[PDB]
Design a protein around this ligand. Sequence first.
Ligand SMILES: CCCCCCC(O)O
Length: 133
Amino acid sequence: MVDAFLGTWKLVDSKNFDDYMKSLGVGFATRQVASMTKPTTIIEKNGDILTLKTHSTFKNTEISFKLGVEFDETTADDRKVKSIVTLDGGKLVHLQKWDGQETTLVRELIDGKLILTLTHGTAVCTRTYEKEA
Ligand SMILES: CCCCCCC(O)O
């Protein structure tokens, strides 16, 4: 069910990421560096456990989770959130909750590219990843 998402992906297009980061309260210097980085995202499974790594010259993260089971997460911008990831309409939907706030990170495959849509407040960011061989 998750298998077309698996692999190594590189950022090749980003729209409105500054808006998204600013909405989350990320400081200007961090937004500035992040606007020029191109992360690599690695998605792997082992049975029911998925591991999602995000690597760059600036920040690295890693999360492991089962679909549909809440997990604690500390995000790249240091929010301590309650997270759940599920498949919805063939999209991989990651919901983060903290302080009564929410943000969604939705991943969808379109023509072999991985489209990540990030929503917080009114900010909507679209980031496109292409698969590494
Ligand atoms: C600021 C929170 C994390 C943003 C992740 C962006 C990505 O391309 O994976």
